[PDB]
Amino acid sequence: MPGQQATKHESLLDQLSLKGKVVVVTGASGPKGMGIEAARGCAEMGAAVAITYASRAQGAEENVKELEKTYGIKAKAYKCQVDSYESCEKLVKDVVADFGQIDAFIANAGATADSGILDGSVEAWNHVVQVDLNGTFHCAKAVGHHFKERGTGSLVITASMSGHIANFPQEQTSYNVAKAGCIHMARSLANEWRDFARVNSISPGYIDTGLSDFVPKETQQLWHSMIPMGRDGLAKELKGAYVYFASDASTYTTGADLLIDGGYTTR
Template sequence: MPVTHATGIGPVPTAAPKLAPNVLDLFSLKGKVASVTGASSGIGKEVAIAYAQAGADVALWYNGNPKAVETAAMLEKEYGVRAKAYKCPITDSAAVEATTAQIVKDFGRLDVQVVNAGVAWEAGPMIDVEGHDEWKKVIDIDLNGAYYAAKAAGRVFKSQGTGSLIFTASMSGHIVNIPQMQACYNAAKAGLLHLSRSLAVEWAGFARSNTVSPGYMITEISNFAPKDTKQKWQQLIPLGREGNPRELVGAYLYFASDASTYTTGADLIVDGGYCAP
């Protein structure tokens, strides 16, 4: 919890940061080290690229897809930043802690942790699924894995006295998707939203915690859906289409940068207006 006054009423005010006078400089990540889980493809890859373009050194996490290694090499060559890929199963708490420690050792610090690794629920209506393996898989990756990564990063942030945690949540944490049935995924993402808000209060003295809630995006995680299902999605999206993951990176840049030093416990929905009606 934040340090409280001697009276026990309210937190001790944190010092106001020194901010650059130019708004574009507020969005710069030069001098920062950013870490992104699930960075081999989709949203994680695009965020890692955007952070390098903004000047950050970047640690890219992957597990089954080693394309993050190629992306790291490309980032160093194209943008002149330091970048390195780390293989780590996000569901292994000891491996997550070890990977986080190695990143700090390799880069010297950790300023931004994007907790993005996740999988979709593809099994259909919950009561029609035999056993509990699919439920455990999604919860273990999307919620428990996020907790492990957040906890490891939070300890680094506390030792530094600063840091920004960003979860990839989902509009599915706000609404119930149709026509596909995915109670497990919705529950996991709703959990991330409240976990982030809770950490924003717990960590207020040394770090910020926020979430980005994407809508339907053109990424591998939605490949399970047949064409007719995607057509139904588009009918419910005011903008009438799925999003390009590049359309998300501004949200992640905002939360990572000094442009958001007074923003914590917030969620930014980027869904083409799906949640608006």
């Protein structure tokens, strides 16, 4: 396939449709996460969906059941520890073997940092990066081989607004740096794979996935006052961006990043 071409579709619903296509989502283990909302939308467009869990399959099995029944499409759960290259390789191999191919891959590494560099140890730095950055790389490396052979593919990397600015008042430089590396990785691979696959990143701001409770009333109040919208966003508001990049609705969009932060980076 001499380079990636434009969509032969004039119809918008056809550009968005993922019938006959396969999409893998590394998140998709919880009930209201960025991951399952990515799987949700993709399934809604008619795509067979593969989803991964880190250590506990339970939540991931209950999602596969939900995705099948509600959207009536083939879905399966697989284990994946993005921080292990062997695990991500196995992921791509088992999926391709079960689904026959992989058209789009949505990677998501969400380890958080709990301090600044000075207060934090080296191990803790290394960890957030290994998982958040090296984790995304493995995903890309593992699936990029598949894409090059098929002469097609869309890689969607979940970054973060934290890849653009540093959150306040929480100190998490390790996390912000791995996220920025993630954003640029999207631009660099977009170019490296320019003949066969598209690469884009989405940078979400504060999104509630059900763990808002574990946050002090003050802390949240301060954050909201910096978000022009004045409220956290929801994962279901991130489903459109994911399908948008995984489908043929962006056949000319590669190496791009879309901040979904309620306007936080506007100030």
